[PDB]
């Protein structure tokens with residue numbers, strides 16, 4: 697997260713870190729056995745770390761659980777990034793508490809202008825690199841589809857939504873993918889892609905979760 | 920050596936943090952960089968051995 701702030705400790709209880717040796721992506725806990733992330737975050741072996749604030753220090757609130765099932769959306773395109781969503785079933789149900797909690801799926805699609813919270817342990821710099829120990833937060837609005845389309849000519853599908861600022865300065869970055877975009881208590885977006893980080897005229901592009909509620913529910917029920 | 924070996928490491932548009940290797944022509948050896956997870960260019964390898972075999976010249 698570039699241009700954000702350090703989240704209050706455990707104030708984003710649904711945020712998880714996907715780890716395969718090192719932190720490589722984020723995710724959101726939707727029920728005690730399932731996490732939703734980005735399809736490009738796929739790896740054959742994934743360990744989900746919940747209740748994290750400082751990913752480099754054993755604090756005492758963490759829960760480490762391995763992924764038992766990893767299911768990418770059947771229509772995910774690795775080049776266009778359309779349908780960039782993935783579900784992870786945990787090997788065992790996590791213990792829900794104030795620091796490890798679920799986030800609700802969208803009741804319907806949120807309109808442009810809706811203010812949201814984006815979070816993650818990704819790079820905090822637009823130029824160069826700084827991997828933060830502490831979870832970063834960013835308050836940003838869903839942008840009008842026309843502005844998203846203008847920023848990324850011919851690259852935006854109905855399954856994508858731009859969140860951020862046309863003037864740049866604040867954005868999600870490498871290490872944030874798969875993470876949450878929560879608006880009014882609902883997971884409306886998943887960190888997906890963008891050209892650079894926090895660059896003017898190139899706000900981050902996110903998977904539009906409201907288009908996948910049925911797929912998510914059907915997949916969970918069948919697995 | 921191949922042309923792609925002389926290009927700077929390409930993170931790409933995706934936002935994951937995937938550690939990959941690239942040939943650093945100035946340094947004369949393969950080093951690590953952060954790959955975003957999609958649309959990789961050719962100077963991107965999953966191992967130092969594969970990187971040096973391909974871009975080592977000689």
Ligand SMILES: [Ca+2]
Pocket residue numbers: 748749750751752753754755756758
């Ligand atoms: Ca920790």
